[PDB]
Write a protein that binds this ligand. Structure first.
Ligand code: BE2
Ligand code: BE2
Lengths: 345, 343
């Protein structure tokens, strides 16, 4: 017999939930039946108990059951996502990597929205580049077919999440809800590079992806970055065929020099947009290096769907393809093509 | 740094104690109607799971007090006591009557609760529970006991009270009742269901230089009973001894938890009338125990007496108060006072 006092009581007593309790709670939230106080109490208690992968899979699965889908046969089977869950943040890096990956010929389907103020959301940077971010499912699918990239604006695909999003804005603090973005991409891409700023939650997310039919790299810079970093090593949870392979990754093995931490963080939408134009135009430096690193990681994830190429040669190839997509102008050109698509309605 | 919800909640979710003043800021937001329900709830839960400190709880209680209606000046005897728990047959209500009848002024504080609460049981007995400060003061003066109805004394708490009801689960706010009695008694017997929080409560009383016994049944009750041993934090002179308490040491037989079972207001009123009329059994025993503890706390405002003799005198005084008829007579005087208000 599920109820808020029961579920909240179990969480505050530091107990993992019974199977189905997280699903019940999410469905109450998603149907407009949870009070703001109940939504907040749940988010916080779940965060402080430390969610399990089973629990997170329930939350994400319920949320997806309420989302608008893309139309039948419209997402390529091998589409990928490239995104972090936030720190500071790296929307600068994930935005540029996504364009690079798509320019390398891998279909990309991203998901997000506008942030409340000045630390750019994913959507805001694209909007500052002239990309049209709020498109219906049919137009997102056209974008994928004609441009090789699409963007699913969270408020349009997840209308029933509005009660949770309001509570999240009111309380400010990061919660378990911050983890759901990468896991509730309404295009349901089966591969991805997914960054997490916290190693304990990264393992949890990897667990959720492992229970899906997915080929993903969940990544955590050992400096706290929610992307593969160039300032030090990163932890990677490699997910494929329902299993996880956790490893320490060092980009110095591919000849990347060490950068400093104040060189990579994203800023506001305009600052991100300027940085995007510089990198896609060929400006060398630590930002480009991190973009190429994370783009290659997405490409490696994508390869995991079919290739069965081994880890090291897959990396060598993802790096060569990412670098080439920039240096040959393919990424600059793809961004311009994406902007053109939007202007043509 | 300017306090904010993101900052405060983030510190709590990182399992960190707050900076001085952060808890105070949160309560003031709450008390002024400036905190949204979601922020109140997030704070209540986060503080609970982190485990509040005495300093933090003192901040919450002090701000809450600052918004409360006071009793009029010089109307509360310097040596008043409270008898109360933080959350089953209203033992604390019977014990309050016995303590008052033993000559110790008592001021209780609470609210209406299917399980009848203290306040609901007093109304079933004919006591007028919702009186303003001037009349609570007069009751204290003329009867030796008073009751502060929480919604009337803490009107600004209504935003928090609604959130509490919405989420259901116990939180740090459950500690506040004993620490925000608007009559500000300096002594008390205070029951708490949870050992860690009982110790936190003791610390706040210690910081106030109160003379209190904070009691924890080793079987999860927020009262003393004859069911089990209990843990007691003896607070006096800003200092704290933690002690084990076993009622078998004073001759009490061990009772079963279900012989103390409460019911509706009418049933609980009958139980009060039976104890005050001198009926023997485990209810009487539990009442005598809690009243004795309150009396011991009261004694602690002047002297620091030997523990065991304090308890013997406390127990004798509580027993006498029943068996002389003084407790039954005090309830009658209390009812009478309330009935005189109309004219
Ligand atoms: N504000 C949001 C943020 C993310 C996902 C959905 C929403 C929504 O309002 O439906
Ligand atoms: N339940 C309460 C306790 C104290 C103050 C106000 C309220 C209220 O309900 O408005």
């Amino acid at each position: 017999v599920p109820s808020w006092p029961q579920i909240l009581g179990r969480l505050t007593d530091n107990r993992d939930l019974a199977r189905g309790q997280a699903a019940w709670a999410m469905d109450q939230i998603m149907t407009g039946n949870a009070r703001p106080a109940q939504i907040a109490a749940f988010a916080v208690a779940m965060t402080m108990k430390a969610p399990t992968a089973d629990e997170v899979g329930e939350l994400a699965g319920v949320m997806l059951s309420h989302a608008h889908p893309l139309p039948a046969d419209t997402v390529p089977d091998d589409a990928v996502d490239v995104v972090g869950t936030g720190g500071v943040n790296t929307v600068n890096l994930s935005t540029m990597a996504a364009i690079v990956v798509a320019a390398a010929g891998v279909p990309v389907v991203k998901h997000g929205n506008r942030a409340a103020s000045s630390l750019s959301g994913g959507a805001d940077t694209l909007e500052a580049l002239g990309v049209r971010i709020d498109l219906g499912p049919d137009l997102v699918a056209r974008s994928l077919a004609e441009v090789g990239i699409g963007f699913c604006f969270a408020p349009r695909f997840h209308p029933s999440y509005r009660h949770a999003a309001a509570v999240r804005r009111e309380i400010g603090v990061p919660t378990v809800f911050n983890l759901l973005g990468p896991l509730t991409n309404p295009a349901r891409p089966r591969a991805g590079l997914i960054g997490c700023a916290f190693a304990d939650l990264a393992e949890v997310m990897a667990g959720v992806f492992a229970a899906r039919r997915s080929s993903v790299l969940v990544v955590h810079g050992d400096d706290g970055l929610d992307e593969l970093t160039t300032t030090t090593t990163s932890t990677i949870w490699r997910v494929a065929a329902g299993s996880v392979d956790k490893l320490t990754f060092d980009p110095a093995g591919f000849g990347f020099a060490r950068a400093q931490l104040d060189q990579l963080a994203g800023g506001d939408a305009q600052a991100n947009a300027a940085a995007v134009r510089a990198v896609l135009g060929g400006a060398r430096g630590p930002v480009r290096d991190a973009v190429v690193l994370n783009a290659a990681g997405a490409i490696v994830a994508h390869a995991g769907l079919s290739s069965r190429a081994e880890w090291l040669p897959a990396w060598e190839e993802g790096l060569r393809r990412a670098s080439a997509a920039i240096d040959t102008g393919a990424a600059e050109q793809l961004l311009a093509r994406w902007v053109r698509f939007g202007r043509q309605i």
